[PDB]
């Protein structure tokens, strides 16, 4: 019930009410139907201040949905540089693989988020990492046809 209000508050971008639920001790790793935590929703809808509050109150940063995707996966896909940096500060698995073998770098490379791609590499991303199809972030940049990204991945 209280963990449910936290999921709706973390998504609806309400900073004030997300903190009120902590005073009342709301389950910070309260997972919905698809297995998304409040951290998942804040990383998705681009709520930076909610991400910081959550991790402060002991949010599991390496929490994964029913398909193996982490909050870092969502931040790096929707191009949330700041949110990506916060999660990596708080100890997000940079080489986190989902069910399909897709990493947070794979998703940054696909949507062509050059600044985030650089943050992930900085923090210890594996460029030679492969998905279930054997395609790397370099393989992506060539098919997608990104020059600025391909030279960064070399």
């Amino acid at each position: 019930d209280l963990g449910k209000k936290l999921l709706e508050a973390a998504r609806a971008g309400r900073d004030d009410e997300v903190r009120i639920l902590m005073a009342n001790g709301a389950d910070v790793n309260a997972a919905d139907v698809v297995g998304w935590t409040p951290l998942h929703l804040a990383a998705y809808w681009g709520h930076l201040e909610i991400v910081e509050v959550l991790l402060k109150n002991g949010a599991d940063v390496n929490a994964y949905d029913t398909l193996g995707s982490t909050p870092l996966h969502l931040a790096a896909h929707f191009g949330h540089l700041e949110i990506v940096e916060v999660l990596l500060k708080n100890g997000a698995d940079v080489n986190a693989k989902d069910d399909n073998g897709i990493t947070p770098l794979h998703l940054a490379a696909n949507r062509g988020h050059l600044e985030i791609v650089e943050v992930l590499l900085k923090y210890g991303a594996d460029v030679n990492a492969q998905d279930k199809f054997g395609k790397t972030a370099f393989d992506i940049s060539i098919n997608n046809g990104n020059e600025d990204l391909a030279e960064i991945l070399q």
Partner: protein, 48 residues
């Protein structure tokens, strides 16, 4: 309001590699999970 939706991505190369048609993939996924109106039949003298 927006709701979670299951985004599946068909890999074209992998399918072309295994020799599986995309038409068969889409018909299989669509017919199975969505339903497919094939043709009419006669139920007690009425077209259904």
């Amino acid at each position: 309001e927006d709701t979670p939706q299951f985004k599946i991505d068909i890999d074209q190369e992998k399918a072309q590699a295994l020799g599986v048609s995309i038409n068969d993939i889409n018909t299989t996924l669509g017919a199975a999970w969505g339903g497919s109106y094939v043709n009419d039949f006669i139920d007690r003298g009425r077209v259904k």
